[PDB]
């Protein structure tokens, strides 16, 4: 309707949410790890190192709290992790500068500061980003188990990283998009219930769990050939329209029978032609696929073009109307293996597909069905490191001095870059030093003076590579600490965070409706 | 509705509701004053409950804004009028009226007769329009010294993409002249989106390159089919090839699959015959609308053919009239045995395909039917190009808008800071009520620059000093020359040296909102016999 | 406390929160009260007397605070003003500003001694580079423009407008007339306001200016044996009788007749005690006066205790009620004792001026005392801003230019030093911008503009601000190079004295 709002009132409510968002997770983030509990209206506890959980589960505070879960999922998609980082970084960067600078009163000179610190981030990152080799799955393994240990898991760090190493390489887009930026669709993650890591097979390709649902279907055939419709399924999907009588019990049934009988004869047209796979993208019927499974023809049914398309190239299956009808072939082998591997009686067909676009659905195994999810998450952010290190072998040592690594270089440029912008630049110079100091405040001692000594150690000795240990609070080498921080993650979390701050800096009025 | 209320329907009964309306209306008008300009702070504005719009465009917001007042009705109305009118002044028309509806009605009852009151705005709404249209003094894409290049540069210079005003200054000069679309009624203006504007994250920010003819966009990475022959000619086709279904549209309900499967076997061969028969009439590069499926993308590449498919029809259309091909002449039905002729041959000097930056196109070189041109942007990243492209677009539309108006008046309130005084002077000597009124007009012309630069944190006194430090008694004249700089950079918020830039608005978008905003002061007045219905 | 017990009004919130704010509001008042300003602060006395001043102690003296926080410190600005002129209006605000950084450090959770010392540490560091900030010194205390350059500052440090001719007339008052070698006298230099004429018409009469009416014939001799008396004539008659007029009637005609020659006796005994001028804190007696006109004894019909004070002070006088033939105790000092008309009022004048007993008494003409008072406020300071009692004052930049100089310096060191000590030493060099923020307001600009440039001017010992348009955009004045300078001395004091309390006032939670 007719409405207007003002400035700091709308600006502080940002921080009011943004701060609380930033709060408990910074004790949860890093080696120091805490539970963010929610009391349900239902009365239940929900205990997380993740904010989005407790956030989503509860009343949404409109300006800030609605903004960050988005940029969280923005960030959660980017490298796979760092929602916690973005949401705390922004609110952090949104706090001390603003009112200070907004009592000095200006949006814009603050805005340019977001970039410069984000730029002062970039350079000294990629300056102090330590190249770690992808030629070594080791120099991936050292950094890949490093980012699977982020909070609570040193356990699945061993297995899930193993699965992630060459998978990321094996992960491909279908453009030959490389594969360093690779997504978790082309990395695809499906945890397979039951089994164990001893049962774990390394699937660097995709599992098609549609492939073998029953032993009747083709199994342990090196590479399939997927015949898509068009001839081997001739075209009648219909029915002969027999009469109906509400009196008889049988007349309701016989009409539905005549609908499936034609695909039954389409799947019969398949038997003689003898594919090993028939992909039916329109699909088949219930009694029809029995006919399919007669000839040892596995049916991939009601499946999209692209699942087949990727799998076809992945599984090395041609694309044809009919084995006696020739446009020739798509691919005979994209897959150096076809594995049909079952836990329970449902066959999960795991087909390792070399550098294929595929899904790269990578077989992961927990000690049970449930902890597979964390393994997957341990496998996800393990791919994060790989895709990071495949992207940039440069990444930064960590344990938190990376967050200082910008912070004091800012202090120098506040005195160097200057202008009146130094004041935003100096006011944003402060934001990056609370987070490690919080890890060290979780340690206590003097988390303050240590950080000043770190701030010394920053310019004195090392900005990040020789850092502070988060669970300790001593001067440490973040390389020798062995905690490695992906370079791109820094490029992501900070960037993503400054923007919602610029965002919630930009909007001083929110009308409802 | 204020005080103890014995009546409904926005009755505060007179000055109260008048004030309450000027309370109402201005309470809307304030969103713009901060939102004025892109540096004008955006507002995250819930559309329903959880649906938030982020907009600094006022009349765009005023469409989100819902009308609970007669004041709320008309400002949304009149700004949405100006909105659909242009889009330049959506914000702007909203600001001053809140004062203009705070002013004249006070005089309208001070009427000897009510008419002379608003005319103090009106002939001033003229007196400015005169002075406005008199302004070539800033905002010149009509001429630079190198003509449009420097003006496009001054545009690009008033912007930053990074390094600009170099190939982009030139690029703006191409874009309009690259467009032979003759806008109706003899308009010497060329739609700037009719340009084929292509982009490369490769090379350099400053770098951009014009292409002979309209550059056809041929799908990249998706063709195992040959698109490439170097010849003078092309065949632009509106047409497509599908082996899965071309002759087959019919349902599967047919009792026998026999018909569908057998023509299905015939569908593939003629798609191999069709390409050759568009090849055999003298077109080896044959530009076909294409759009083949995913598993059908398998069927052609495995079986084989040559056709250029899945091309942008916008280009293919532009390339069609460019080179002189015909997308449709004898083509109606879908088939591979369909007849084909030479009337579909596009005429270029050569037809070449150049890959650069890791991007390749089908280049129709010197299209013989119409002069055609496409500039391909070069960024450091895909980011850089949206910067150059739109910084260009600043000049581009203005260049066309200067093709729309020779009179092109300074962007920014520095046009008003003059008008806020000259007409403030044009108030006194007028005498009586329009003396009262013309000042109310002019003195309120001051508010746009204040707010805008406040939005850019260039604020008021400085700006309004600088603006009217230029204008003097010695400088009363729009002129073209600046010892009075009547220009104001919108993005800077501070008046600057850009006299040529495409960040300034022509007199088109200007003279209106004067008429618009005062109407709002008029529009609210109109009541006779205030009443209530029950 | 939790209990019924003990005595405290500070501590907990108060120490941290409320004392700092008690350490705030008045500093907040003093911010444009110091330095070049157009700020003005109205005040009413216990007289309910409407007056305006940017001087603190005037305002201060009538301010009561339950806390010692605001209370105790003001002595320092006085302890300061005990030493010098203004800079006093700077003293407290320097503290209050740098203080509230600590409550932030208290939010940041820094320990008292941790907060305490870095200032104290850097308080040296200030005093250490403070001499490096000596850009000049005081050459001729006899010269007007040598001195007027300074005097303009405390006046400026008081108020912006009137500073110049003041700084002139005060050296035209001849602060010259003393060596100021360690010998300087503001008892021999007095500001005596004539209500009348203008303040540009305000003069300085060297020799005591008493606007009090010179009563009857002037001094017997100019080396005046002076009889200063609180009540030299209370009347010699008592009329109490049958009617307290007449009952036995002729008994009346005795005393009204016998009274006056006792006033003659006293006045003759003023001539007999030897006073070349008699001085009445009490009334004049007309016959006595007439006798004192016969005896040609200069007289003052009525004498302020202030009069009598300076009278008793400098003459060696003793103001006494006398119903007796008088006794010289008071005797003389001043070797020329005159009548002047300045603003055209009888001015009782006493001048012995020896360059040591040297009396240069500023005589302010003006049509308003409140005028001549807020004037005299800055005039109070200029003379004793001039009063360093170093003939060479090691002139340092006026107006606050030295501030930013050490803002860079000592926080750059504050950078270098480690630990929690840092911000202690770091906040220290941040204490400057307060007034560069404060006067920047009355100047009309934000302090970032000011300070970024006051930083970007870097080491100057000139470039600075105040109430000016130079103080607006440029963040540049000449607070050295224009003739606005400061003695090295009060600097050390304005620095040190406030640093002590700011440290100390927090440490007490009681």
Short mmCIF file of C-alpha atoms in Angstrom, two decimals, chain A residues 11 20 47 64 101 121 134 200 211 217 222 229 259 263 287 312 346-347 353 372 424 444 463 483 496:
data_model
loop_
_atom_site.label_atom_id
_atom_site.label_comp_id
_atom_site.label_asym_id
_atom_site.label_seq_id
_atom_site.Cartn_x
_atom_site.Cartn_y
_atom_site.Cartn_z
CA UNK A 11 19.97 -1.49 9.01
CA UNK A 20 22.86 -13.88 16.13
CA UNK A 47 21.80 -29.56 18.11
CA UNK A 64 18.87 -10.66 7.38
CA UNK A 101 30.35 4.70 9.34
CA UNK A 121 41.76 -11.19 0.41
CA UNK A 134 46.77 -33.00 -7.77
CA UNK A 200 32.96 -50.46 -0.38
CA UNK A 211 19.84 -50.83 -14.46
CA UNK A 217 18.34 -58.42 -16.60
CA UNK A 222 31.15 -55.38 -19.90
CA UNK A 229 12.28 -46.98 -28.62
CA UNK A 259 -3.49 -50.98 -22.22
CA UNK A 263 3.99 -52.31 -24.74
CA UNK A 287 3.73 -57.23 -17.62
CA UNK A 312 25.04 -43.92 -22.74
CA UNK A 346 17.77 -54.61 -4.85
CA UNK A 347 20.66 -54.55 -7.29
CA UNK A 353 32.71 -44.58 -16.22
CA UNK A 372 26.23 -43.00 4.63
CA UNK A 424 35.51 1.84 5.97
CA UNK A 444 40.65 -18.57 25.83
CA UNK A 463 50.02 -13.93 7.73
CA UNK A 483 44.89 -27.79 8.30
CA UNK A 496 29.41 -14.11 -1.02
#
